[PDB]
């Protein structure tokens, strides 16, 4: 996935926030405490007009 | 050990509020004793 900047909010030593399908949406750097949301980079079907 | 705490301001008298308040928590220690009684410590 990508990884971008985050407008989100976490407890003072929180770790990540997971989502509904059991897929972690966002993670906090283990180096710098800064918190990044995943996003999985871009993907979808593909038809053909002929 | 996990300790859970939230300080919140009331100005209720003498019973616990109506409301909610989750408790962050606070601090974890791996001793992995047992406990079973406890006791709390009041200043005089
Ligand atoms: C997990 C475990 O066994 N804990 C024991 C308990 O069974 C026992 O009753 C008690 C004192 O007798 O000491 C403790
Ligand atoms: C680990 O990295 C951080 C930032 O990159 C730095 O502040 C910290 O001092 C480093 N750890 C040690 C033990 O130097």
Redesign the interface.
């Known amino acids: 996935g990508v990884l971008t900047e985050s407008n989100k909010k976490f ?2 030593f929180q770790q990540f926030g997971r989502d509904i399908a059991d897929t972690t949406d966002a993670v906090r750097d283990p180096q710098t405490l800064e918190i990044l949301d995943i996003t999985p980079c871009s993907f979808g079907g593909v038809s053909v007009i002929t | 050990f996990k300790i859970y705490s939230k300080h919140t301001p009331i100005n209720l008298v003498r019973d616990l509020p109506q409301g909610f308040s989750a408790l ?2 606070l601090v974890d220690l791996p001793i992995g004793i047992n406990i079973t009684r406890f006791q709390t410590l009041l200043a005089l």
């Open positions: 407890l003072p | 962050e928590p």
